[model samples]
Target: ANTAFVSSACNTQKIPSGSPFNRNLRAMLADLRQNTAFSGYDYKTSRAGSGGAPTAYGRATCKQSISQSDCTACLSNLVNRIFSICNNAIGARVQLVDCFIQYEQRSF
Candidate 1:
């Protein structure tokens, strides 16, 4: 059977009202929800503080038999769709493979 994991970190601080990071984070989550290949994955969110600047990190993996093209397509779709949904999240990232899709949030 195939297995996968999703993890993320976020700023503990509350984001500003109109911060780019907030927009980007939302976009990433939305994209992940819209993508079919990423549907079954589990997600976890954590922060260091209630209103302090925080960061996130995560990883994903898929089975070995899947095709690269399919993987790439899924990932590409996720990226585009995410931007469409959440235009206000601060930080996000996704990894797509033939067997699965993984995502996370973090600050640089």
Candidate 2:
């Protein structure tokens, strides 16, 4: 089936303003901005960052039909969205028609 990514209109779920969590999230988002550009066929990544009180974990995923270029662009935009939409959150996620993003500061 030559199916495209679908199911929902679009969503950008985000956590709320927190402590070091927000700071950690910022770092992880920057990392993802570059990782997604060349994450390859998987077009997804999950990385753990250093920082006490708020262990940050970043993850990014692209729709099956999305290409490297589009995935890059989408993820790039997500970084910006994170800053604008969830700048103060300990965790946040933006789901789009072409990709999905999840950023968190949780241990486990």
Candidate 3:
């Protein structure tokens, strides 16, 4: 089905469904997909809101054996295994076979 899949790590600490954190997470996911799709093998990115208590931080990357720009311009999740790994899980090292996505409820 032309789906991209990867192995990853996530924290047991979960975010409440439909929280601002989740909203930000979705935002970060969008940003990460855009940023990394054109970036490098070890490329990285983060997303955050203007200002608020308990800010969230997120980063994602895709390993490159070739120029990312030479390929599709987006890392759209054809199939979501992230949720199966840990629903609303927080923290780093969300790795896939070709990409990785990491996030935190706290910005640090």
What TM-score would each prediction reach against the true structure?
A: 0.32, 0.61, 0.68
lDDT per residue as tens, model 2, 1-108: 112333322224444445445555666666676676476523333345444444666666766676677777776765666555554455565666666667655532
CA lDDT of each prediction against the hidden true structure: 0.39, 0.56, 0.56
Error of 1 at 50 (Å): 18
Candidate 2 residues lying further than 4 Å off, grouped into runs, are 1-23, 40-53
lDDT of 3 by residue, 1-105 (tens): 123555566687776555566665667767666666555544444556443414456565555663575223324551155666666675545565556666676
Lowest-scoring 10 consecutive residues by lDDT in candidate 3?
70-79
What TM-score would candidate 2 get against the native? 0.61
lDDT of 2 at 88: 45
Backbone clashes in candidate 3 total 5
RMSD, one per candidate, in order: 10.0, 5.6, 3.6
For model 2 the local lDDT of residue 89 reads: 51
Off by over 4 Å in 1: 1-53, 62-64, 85-108
Q: Report the alpha-carbon TM-score of model 1 versus the true structure.
A: 0.32
The residue-by-residue lDDT of candidate 1 on 1-108, one tens digit each, is 211223333323344675444444444434433443353333333333223433333232333455444543544455454333334244334333333333334522
